[PDB]
Ligand binder design. Sequence first.
Ligand SMILES: CO[C@@H]1[C@@H](OC(N)=O)[C@@H](O)[C@H](Oc2ccc3c(O)c(NC(=O)c4ccc(O)c(CC=C(C)C)c4)c(=O)oc3c2C)OC1(C)C
Ligand code: NA
Ligand code: NA
Ligand code: NA
Ligand code: NA
Ligand code: NA
Lengths: 186, 188
Amino acid sequence: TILEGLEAVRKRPGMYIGSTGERGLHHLIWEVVDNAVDEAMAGFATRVDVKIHADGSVEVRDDGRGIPVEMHATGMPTIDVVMTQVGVSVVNALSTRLEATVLRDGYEWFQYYDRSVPGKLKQGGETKETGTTIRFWADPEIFETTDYNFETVARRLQEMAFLNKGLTIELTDERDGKHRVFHYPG
Amino acid sequence: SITILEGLEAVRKRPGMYIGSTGERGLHHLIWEVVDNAVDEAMAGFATRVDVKIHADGSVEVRDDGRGIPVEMHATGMPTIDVVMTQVGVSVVNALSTRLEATVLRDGYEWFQYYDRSVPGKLKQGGETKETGTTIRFWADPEIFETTDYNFETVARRLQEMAFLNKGLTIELTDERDGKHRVFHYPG
Ligand SMILES: CO[C@@H]1[C@@H](OC(N)=O)[C@@H](O)[C@H](Oc2ccc3c(O)c(NC(=O)c4ccc(O)c(CC=C(C)C)c4)c(=O)oc3c2C)OC1(C)C
Ligand code: NA
Ligand code: NA
Ligand code: NA
Ligand code: NA
Ligand code: NA
């Protein structure tokens, strides 16, 4: 049933991200970034870092509270409930791979998803830091393009910074070295 | 299999036999081993660039554009990359790390592997690419080392020396803890 839900996304992605061209591809970034910016609005995060990797993956890191990793009532870690059932599960469904690294509850935690199928959540080292890193690889079977446009992403992140005064958003493109930092005082 | 585990446990039992000591000098030996493997690939004529990143979580990432660690099934019934990470020089880094991740571009694909206290995960085949190279990210074990705090200046001075001794190689160093950076490239 959880698998059927994610397969429904792959069958009709337009129902979830509007379309499967360049605008649909960029929706994967908007979803993950919106989740990070939500932590800034909530008063926990101060910075969101976005990287476009040369392998076509995108990495989004925040210093918010960290996606909860404790066991959920449904019998999987809460992070796995999130990545299989809520908004960002669409990103998992339409990615060949998603990795999550969370700083929370005194530890670094590692999870991966292989075509949306969770690995086993691993507890890493001790840390007082909190936050979330998500890295995802858009599925080229789904999208008409896997080419992210730096200028499109930069203009969106600059507007997000303008609506969320005091938030810093950094964007790095590892394909060609482009780098921008956006922030408005607040 | 018993022998492979015995070998890694021998390293944890007496790390001084393999990296000299378990203070700061010993800690920095983990970076030298991984970087040495990348620089050797470059100067054997297969790579042009080595990128070293000290992450805010205390992990170190070393990336090269060399041939990539071989990933094909080995005669022993595990992938060659798992033989490498459990048996050769870099297996000392794996043994003295709580975690090691390898991302290899080779044989037409991006490949993902992890090691939890040197125990391999299942090697995963990712997307298609002609590109080749190796990325290793490792988390030094604080139960082994007296300190896990790498020194930017120590790393920079050693990488500068490596670039000087290997003319034509680019070595880039970034430290996400405090934003420090260097790029070394001696023409040759
Ligand atoms: C993709 O996850 C997103 C988050 O994205 C990021 N990047 O943080 C963020 O947008 C937002 O994050 C929330 C949203 C609400 C709470 C929240 O209400 C918390 N309060 C708790 O006491 C708490 C503790 C454990 C727990 O399982 C839950 C409910 C489960 C949630 C929020 C998934 C809540 C908390 O600690 O963290 C929260 C966090 C991190 O919602 C998620 C989890 C869907
Ligand atoms: Na949507
Ligand atoms: Na959403
Ligand atoms: Na935080
Ligand atoms: Na990883
Ligand atoms: Na290469």
